[PDB]
Amino acid sequence: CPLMVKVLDAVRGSPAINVAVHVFRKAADDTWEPFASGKTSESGELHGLTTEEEFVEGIYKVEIDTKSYWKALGISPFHEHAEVVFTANDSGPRRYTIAALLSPYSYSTTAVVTNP
Amino acid sequence: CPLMVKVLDAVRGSPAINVAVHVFRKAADDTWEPFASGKTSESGELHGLTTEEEFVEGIYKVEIDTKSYWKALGISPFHEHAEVVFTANDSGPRRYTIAALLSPYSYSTTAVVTNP
Amino acid sequence: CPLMVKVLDAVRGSPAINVAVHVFRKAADDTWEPFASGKTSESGELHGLTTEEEFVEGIYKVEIDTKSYWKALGISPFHEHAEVVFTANDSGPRRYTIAALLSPYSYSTTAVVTNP
Amino acid sequence: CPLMVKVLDAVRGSPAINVAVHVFRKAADDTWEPFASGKTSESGELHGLTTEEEFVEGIYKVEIDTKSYWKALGISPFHEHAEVVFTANDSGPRRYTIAALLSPYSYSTTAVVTNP
Numbered sequence: 003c004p005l006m007v008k009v010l011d012a013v014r015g016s017p018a019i020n021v022a023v024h025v026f027r028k029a030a031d032d033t034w035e036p037f038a039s040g041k042t043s044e045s046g047e048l049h050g051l052t053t054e055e056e057f058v059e060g061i062y063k064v065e066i067d068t069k070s071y072w073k074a075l076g077i078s079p080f081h082e083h084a085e086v087v088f089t090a091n092d093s094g095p096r097r098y099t100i101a102a103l104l105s106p107y108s109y110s111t112t113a114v115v116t117n118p
Numbered sequence: 119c120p121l122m123v124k125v126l127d128a129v130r131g132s133p134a135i136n137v138a139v140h141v142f143r144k145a146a147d148d149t150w151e152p153f154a155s156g157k158t159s160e161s162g163e164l165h166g167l168t169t170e171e172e173f174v175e176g177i178y179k180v181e182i183d184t185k186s187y188w189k190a191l192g193i194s195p196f197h198e199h200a201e202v203v204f205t206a207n208d209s210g211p212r213r214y215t216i217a218a219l220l221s222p223y224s225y226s227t228t229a230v231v232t233n234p
Numbered sequence: 235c236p237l238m239v240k241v242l243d244a245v246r247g248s249p250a251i252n253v254a255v256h257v258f259r260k261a262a263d264d265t266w267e268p269f270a271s272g273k274t275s276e277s278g279e280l281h282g283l284t285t286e287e288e289f290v291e292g293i294y295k296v297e298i299d300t301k302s303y304w305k306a307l308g309i310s311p312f313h314e315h316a317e318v319v320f321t322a323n324d325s326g327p328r329r330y331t332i333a334a335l336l337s338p339y340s341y342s343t344t345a346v347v348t349n350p
Numbered sequence: 351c352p353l354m355v356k357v358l359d360a361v362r363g364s365p366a367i368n369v370a371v372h373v374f375r376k377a378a379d380d381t382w383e384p385f386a387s388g389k390t391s392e393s394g395e396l397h398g399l400t401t402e403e404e405f406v407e408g409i410y411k412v413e414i415d416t417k418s419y420w421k422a423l424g425i426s427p428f429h430e431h432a433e434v435v436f437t438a439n440d441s442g443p444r445r446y447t448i449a450a451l452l453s454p455y456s457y458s459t460t461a462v463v464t465n466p
């Protein structure tokens with residue numbers, strides 16, 4: 003699994019479940035073409051977005067719909083979304099976990115990049 | 119000063135100086151119009167981007183050029199940039215500090231919103 | 235597994251491997267009695283610290299030896315360690331993951347608390 | 351002002367006001383001696399804890415009473431407190447800002463260290 007997204011909730015101390023996640027790849031004309039999407043599981047994880055053949059070098063964007071998550075919990079959020087943009091596979095294919103820790107007025111994001 | 123951006127370096131425990139910051143506002147036709155730009159000072163802060171009169175209700179995007187900051191230190195970081203997108207002033211005028219704390223493979227961002 | 239500790243490295247974008255972790259429980263005379271210890275695995279995780287019978291209600295401390303980790307990488311750290319202190323099981327037993335995301339001059343820590 | 355502590359609330363996007371902070375210094379016999387204390391102001395900042403002359407080289411501990419902050423807002427948070435332990439001034443006098451960004455089940459902390 004070359005790309006996994008994990009989302010955590012810092013208010014409740016839990017996985018952030020049912021969070022919508024959309025992934026894009028930058029096109030040659032600098033626009034964002036859709037690539038994959040899903041919703042986080044009960045563990046806060048979204049697996050199966052891509053395959054190693056399809057996940058070529060490129061610039062990728064992961065947009066996490068944080069606003070809808072907080073609205074569903076009845077909590078006022080600051081951000082419209084949380085976006086993570088990164089160049090992938092520049093030194094060979096890697097396994098990427100993009101993690102985000104959400105609070106209503108703040109988020110943290112990190113990448114765990116491992117070599118299979 | 120209705121909008122201030124502050125950037126910190128979590129590796130050195132310092133302000134992140136000379137970081138380029140570009141601010142955009144969403145126009146009525148859903149495109150991103152350039153709104154203001156600048157670079158962080160020796161304190162890691164960027165003041166003077168806008169005025170109370172100009173900073174009307176809207177959806178704003180703050181793009182922080184984190185990649186160039188790390189590259190100038192010899193580091194190839196994970197993220198292309200850090201973007202913060204938020205609705206401003208929808209309950210009346212507020213003062214916003216948008217802060218980002220940078221590491222090569224992670225960042226955190228928070229908003230401090232006050233009512234003068 | 236009632237208690238797991240996970241440690242990530244925000245500089246390298248990786249699990250933080252071989253990090254020493256010590257766990258204590260607060261004694262009746264308000265001193266910290268040793269409870270368990272280990273080192274993080276190649277996945278940054280430390281499992282098997284306790285059992286559900288032994289992990290009774292109480293105040294627990296997890297001390298993560300961040301300074302030794304950064305020294306082993308040749309990077310100057312700020313903190314002596316990262317400590318997490320929390321009351322456990324106050325509403326019944328839970329499964330706790332204590333996670334820490336490390337940078338040389340900053341860390342983040344969160345708890346993911348789930349009900350089996 | 352050689353030591354300043356700043357506390358922010360990631361739920362409301364605000365300073366964390368009236369947070370108690372206690373500072374200790376490690377004595378030659380390895381015990382923690384009380385050094386200074388105070389509470390955060392309306393800006394979330396606590397100034398005036400020490401002076402350049404008194405703030406000698408040593409190992410310092412800053413304990414932030416995060417639990418009482420959340421409890422006064424009706425919340426039972428995960429952590430009992432947030433502690434930050436660090437060696438100060440070992441390369442000569444520096445100015446330290448110790449910041450903490452609080453959520454009910456998570457916190458981040460960073461140090462900004464400057465040379466006047």
Ligand SMILES: O=C(c1cc(O)cc(F)c1)c1cc(O)c(O)c([N+](=O)[O-])c1
Nearest residue numbers: 101103110112333334335342343344346
């Ligand atoms: O990114 C993080 C993370 C972010 C922070 O701000 C603070 C922190 F302690 C961890 C993370 C990544 C993972 O892969 C993961 O499993 C977990 N977890 O389970 O708790 C967390």
Ligand SMILES: O=C(c1cc(O)cc(F)c1)c1cc(O)c(O)c([N+](=O)[O-])c1
Nearest residue numbers: 217219226228449450451458459460462
């Ligand atoms: O956003 C933060 C911040 C982010 C984190 O991950 C952890 C933390 F403790 C603070 C911040 C904001 C500010 O306005 C500010 O002055 C400072 N500071 O000087 O240190 C920091």
